[model samples]
Target: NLTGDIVIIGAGAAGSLLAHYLARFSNMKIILLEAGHSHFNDPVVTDPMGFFGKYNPPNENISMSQNPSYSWQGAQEPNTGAYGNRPIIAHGMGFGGSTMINRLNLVVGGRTVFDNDWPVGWKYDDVKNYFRRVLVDINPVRDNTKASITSVALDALRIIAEQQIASGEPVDFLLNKATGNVPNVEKTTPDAVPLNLNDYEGVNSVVAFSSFYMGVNQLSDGNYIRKYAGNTYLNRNYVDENGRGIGKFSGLRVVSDAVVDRIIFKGNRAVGVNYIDREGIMHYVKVNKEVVVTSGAFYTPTILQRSGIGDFTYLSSIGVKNLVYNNPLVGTGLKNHYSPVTITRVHGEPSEVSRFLSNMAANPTNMGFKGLAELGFHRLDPNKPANANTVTYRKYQLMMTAGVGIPAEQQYLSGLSPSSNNLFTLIADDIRFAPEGYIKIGTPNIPRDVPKIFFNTFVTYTPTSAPADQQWPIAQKTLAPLISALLGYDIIYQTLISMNQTARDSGFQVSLEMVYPLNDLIYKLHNGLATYGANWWHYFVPTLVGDDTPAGREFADTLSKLSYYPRVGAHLDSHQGCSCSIGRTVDSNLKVIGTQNVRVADLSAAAFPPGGNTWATASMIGARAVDLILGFPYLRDLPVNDVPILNVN
Candidate 1:
């Protein structure tokens, strides 16, 4: 038997970050056990661009086979949808977990959602303090620069912002401002007049709380939060005093390729864990202080069930005779967001500037040059303000260079060249709204296996789509018209410029009028619109209209294809909800309900639709769990006054 002060299961974002914190405060040994090997050198898991592409890719490689097969446990079992029968929800297996492959966009929910959904103990103010602490290095843009927005991306964003404001959508910025300093209405005297809701909504709702907001502002300038924290950051500080590579556990103990089979408990208290190593050698490790289960939503509950600490009847039925049914809430509330595909075909040449930028991004060495080019070419330097006339010239030049700009379509852009392009699809996803689901114990036999996760997704209806249809069509319809109008504007601008150039060459009377007739331009726009509308959803409704192009036809043919093959006696649940489950399976202190000295701290505990991507949230949750473990004062009380950086020799 082995021992440590804390046994952290699942060395992903949360577990790893939490370990870093615990090591700093306590002198006790912390052992982090990961199911997968150290993945930093895993070729398939590190490349950013290759993450989701067709060919050789970088980023975490998701092994579909690792997920256990299961029959859905619901009243009316239906066949799995077009995606698959036993769907493999993207759960990372290695150290960094899904963060290794995520977009790294840190987004926080609006105060209303946080205040409403989180448990009574968790408040918006508490979370806000944590958010600030988590973000040690404020991206200069987020903290100081009001005008340091990425220029190439801003025009498209402005269009989206304008449309959202015009349409009265619930934007993030407006929400923050409206609720930022509002007195607790419940605490106010009965005679106090309520603030005007209309003016507040219009004046302050801007949806600017996101990881992209943080990264673009903070990390873009090579400034990381750990620099000020004085805490020894992991991954970044992989070298020791001698400058040699510090292996996995420089100051911490990390056991990789160790698949934990069961948590060893003594009369309701978690004592240790039983695991199998890379060579299939079974071993047991004892925990001294506490055992923290940060194996995310699926694995944490499954581990509890295996250790005989879940629902009593369920555990008994599955042969876990050593029953300790502490918290039936082990694998309950689950939530997540999904995206529907919206394809829009545009008739124009691809932007030369976009192509050049894409190429520069591809080559590692050219990244610096690309950043400089983005600022120089776009003239985004706020210090050197351009006059109104120069701004007009800049706008005209941008229109000519980019070909077209539109509001809804700004979400996506792709083209072959600048003049006549065949197709570009605008993909829009409402990631905020999604139904909740649950994760439940599947079997007592395979304790380490992920629980049966039920995500009741695809329920929320888009404004433009019918209940029976997916939301993709609505997104397409909303954005398509805007794209068509922008294309027309580009054509007119090009024609006018051409006339000016011709006059200059001839040295005669120069008449620069809009050469492209509005009607003709409208006709081309109409044709482009028709193409997308007709071909869209070809895969979903292939029988109606099918594509002949090799890739298109292949996808069209496979529309009804499900990932899992039919199991003769298997039942299925067709519930539409969040892909990931969320709830207080564990209490505010991160301790599992009823189980002594055991805790869960991962994405599974996130009880709302994730604010943005799950990676940053997972990390934040880990940080929170560390605070709980160490009994640190609530994040708000942790002094935010700038602390001096400690130089560790």
Candidate 2:
């Protein structure tokens, strides 16, 4: 049995970041074990433009590469054949883990989301500080001028802005209108509507004025926004004074191509991990200090059960004598965000050059306003009636968009036309709804076996007419119709009759996509299982009712089912999330409860459902985990304050 002072499982975001800090202060020997390779190429790492292209086509045989200079490794685990199932849990086998292929959006948890589920110790302020620390080397404040746009996109945005102003209804926008302090209102027209410019030249200016931009930027003065982009920031900035990546403790070895089989436990405390190396040699690495399991939400629980730390009865049945059922909360509260697609058909031909140029010109600085406005809008209490909720947020976003000259292709990537007419799609997700899911241990010995993640996504809507399910169905039913009405299309006919020259000639349809808030499609999907079994594609096509159902329904269904059970189903293609396990698997301190010295430091630990993009939160969690491992004062648990009674409007 090999031994180390500390054993960190999964060398993804959390483990890597934590190692950097722990090595800086403590002399503890650490061992970082991963399941994949390292050293990803630009196509595998930094292809922002080709966002979904690489993921859509999964290459199971592609072994992840590692940066050998950083003590990286390529780890692999074969199907343990436990419980008669193959390992479906997708995790990084390389050094950087999932960080190598993530989009690197540095978004933080909103106040609402943070307050809802985060443990008291992991509050917004605490998280924000850690976020700022890890992001110090990178820049978040960049010019938004590089974003792309077209004339058609501009006109489409104008139409929506006009409708927003005319209806006197607000959409998500910057500035607190309730406080009568509006920032960047000058970007809008006299009627409080935004202007549709022919180019994205004005887009960044408007975004800057409105305050809704994301991403980091470099300033002329040499300062940066400290925003992140996957492993780029961490690998580049957080280095040792000698310039040799500082995080490697004396015994802190990052072993790759090693697939962990199970935790070797001594009674209730985890002592070491049993893994199969690349050559299929089963080896055990004992942890003199602790064995932290950071595999991820899906596999963390499985590892625990395999080590005889799950439900007592289940462990006993598996013939494991060293049984210790510590926490029943092992995998109970599994959560994931559910979103629906809303696509707008542009009334012009697609152009690669135009799209490229448009994106190149989008300004990062201007996006802050948009981001801020969204933050404010999301903070509004959803429990209140729609009318009662202030229109400030929505109005602000419309006004900002109007001034920016709709850069559809840049952000949304819908093709544009020279005729200056296009469709604008907005995919809306419900943040207030709480859907419960479970991650159960399916096998007794296989550590990599995918846990049975059962999401009651649509099941809560049962009895079909409960108040809790009202917002969902209502949102769903009204979504498509609302888009049709907004884009001047009739939902019944599925045609663009009231055409603005470009739209009429471009042969495009105007429509909207709704997700989560509606139950009809879900109901149909569940019932259809009786006939189609579990084929989502077949169910979506027949159940979807909208103007663009022919082409759009399939796409919408695909995105909606991404976070569901088994991850990929009939509706979903081959897009596995970043393999690095973090969150949900461990506590805020990165310590694996029930284990004497084991800790988890990855996305699986942040276990809450992702709030939109997860890159930022994951990175922040990684940094925070580092602090916890080093025994920093910041990692101490804080007392909970009284819950604020939010007043809508």
Candidate 3:
């Protein structure tokens, strides 16, 4: 028996960071298994700029989808709705997971607290302070000012000023950092804001960065390093005694490039894991206390299924026997901040603004001006009857888009394809409330192929791959806005200002709104693709945003025309979780509701529904699980910021 207090599968932000504190504070032997490379010194994987070169366009197996095909409503045997293919993505396969290649854009539920009908101890208020503890670990600094900002942000700010035509009043553009602290509304702030719930609604546009720690160092940085669990919480230290995952905490071991096939359980308890080494050798490691699975939104379910813990029907199809009969929620509700069609280029060439962005990325000192640096929110149609504002209510939300890039444009695109001049991206993702997606292991032959995720990327193939295909045409309309990934707001104030000619005459740079509403355009102004062939704004209508009455049905039915093909924003994550969610898979105490000593603390436990960014939230989940496993009070049952400090028993 490979004895250990806890065995954690997958060393992403959650797994590694959890191991760090558990070993540091408690006398537990933590074992961490990483499915990809874990060498800490390789500049290509260690340094932010050094690592960015590998997957800039996200090619091959680096950061693409791991499934045979992805779809809107996956066609797998287990999942029910979402027929169209939507090309879901895997964050990153390596130890740090997406934090390695991620754009470092942090976000939480901007509208308010997480709105899921979570079980007893897992609501927004429950985990808000846990998030604070993670925020406490991070400390980032990015220039958030006016003069040197994104072309779209500045453009949008001007439009906002013009909205009411405020001549003398100050612009009052305040920059809030995503420090995970309570929402800092003004200049005079401290950690004592009784800061718990993070839902703030403001009239004026606000500019905030996806705030978190920036440097590679938790203490200090040697160069311009990106904050990641791979480097920050986990790394290879000096030649000394063992302490694999973090500091001098012995027995906290780690195995890299090791693939875990399934968790080995006995009756109703998770006891260990069976994983493969890089050399294709198989091994089993045991856990005494519990098993924490941090394999992320997609693979967590994959592993769960492989261990024979899903819907008996789906498990049988994938050649696995049932370990549990009541597995209704294994891989079903695949929640995400979903999105659509991409591209919106500013007419002119790369002017001074474009050069400024390149200069900013050149090095740290030149970190002036911001690219992905502004946001705002709006209702799809305020005039339209209001839809569900609760866990079920989501009437096709809208945001403003104005920028200096092609994505210089959409949420994920503006992010994946940064470094541009004129970006006018109006990202419109139907905030997912009732997610009906699923996942399936593509093969029975252990560790060879990954799981199959269904969002129906393309009609027959990947829709985003062929943007020119008329099957799912991009919205030829006056576009709107985005959610957390790019945080959004650049859209609200800059509405209709994208009327290029109108903007140019107003001494503004060139920009065009995706207004299919323009009476005269190449394509007709219509929202009803009702067939599911429409790209971006047109395809993901009422289906994704769901309104109860005619207005909701009108939007959903019309935009969903074509029932043919569909698309990814890279940011519109269908990978958002809730399958083995709270109240179902694990109890309020975090153990498997049925099984013993097995708990999930990753996006898999995202029983709280769609609100926070997966990475940042996973960090808090990992931290909170640490307390749970130790019987540290009712960590998940409390008011905001009312956390107590606990020491070893």
Per-model TM-score on C-alpha atoms: 0.57, 0.58, 0.66
Write candidate 1's Cα lDDT for 1-649 as tens digits.
5677788888666776677666655667677787764433443333333343423324634332232211111221122332334444445565555444443334444344455557776666566665556655322122222111123223233333344345542321111233333311111233324222112112212222111232321235443221211122434354233222244444466677777768877887777788888787898988887888776655666676677776787777767767775556656655444322222222223453233223222221111111100001111111112232121111111111112222232223322233433222221223342234555665566543435666543321224324424654554443332222233233333333443444344333333333122234334433433455534333444433434676555554332231111121112211122222334456666666666887777776776653334454566677777777787664446576742232222
lDDT of 2 by residue, 42-159 (tens): 4434333233344434644233322232222322223121112222224444555554543334434344345445677766556655555544533344233423232333334334
What lDDT does the true structure give each of the candidates? 0.43, 0.42, 0.49
Give per-model CA RMSD.
14.4, 12.4, 10.2
TM-score of structure candidate 1: 0.57
Name the better of 2 and 3 by TM-score.
3
State the lDDT of candidate 3 residue by residue for 72-151, as single tens digits: 12223322223432333555666566676555544444333353345556665666666655554553444323222234
Candidate 3 segments exceeding 4 Å error: 50-88, 115-117, 144-222, 237-248, 316-318, 321-325, 341-435, 456-575, 608-612, 633-649
Using lDDT, give the best candidate's number: 3
Model 1 collision count: 36
Residue 123 alpha-carbon offset, candidate 2, angstroms: 2.2
